[PDB]
Each structure stands twice: as C-alpha cells, then as structure tokens.
C-alpha cells in the first residue's frame, strides 16, 4: 500500500468534467471523482482495476 494511497482526491484548477478513480482508504474502495482536466496527483486511475491493483 504505496503512500499516495492515503492522499485525497485532487480535482485541481482546470476546469473539464473528467471521471476518475481514486483509492478511499477509508472505505477500502475505489470511488469516482471529478478530475480537472490538469496537474493530476497520483491517487488518481482511469479506470476501478488500476486503482485497485495499485491500492487495494
């Protein structure tokens, strides 16, 4: 379980409607978000499988 597996979601400033996947460390899922469109973090997969072979 690499670090960035705890970061929140980052929408960042730019301003798309872009579905992403992110790893909630609470809830032990992979949950959707709004991603910007720019300056994308590392807890941030393009599709639930990614997000879980990297953090689940």
């Not at 379980?1 to 597996?5: G, K, L, N, V, Y």
């Not at 960042?12 to 798309?16: D, L, N, Q, S, V």
């Given at each position: 379980?690499?670090?960035?597996?705890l970061e929140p979601p980052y929408t960042?400033?730019?301003?798309?409607r872009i579905i992403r996947y992110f790893?909630?460390?609470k809830a032990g899922l992979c949950q959707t978000f709004?991603?910007?469109g720019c300056r994308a973090k590392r807890n941030?997969?393009?599709s639930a499988e990614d997000c879980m072979r990297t953090c689940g």
């Open positions: 379980r690499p670090d960035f597996c960042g400033p730019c301003k798309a790893a909630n460390a709004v991603y910007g941030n997969f393009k």
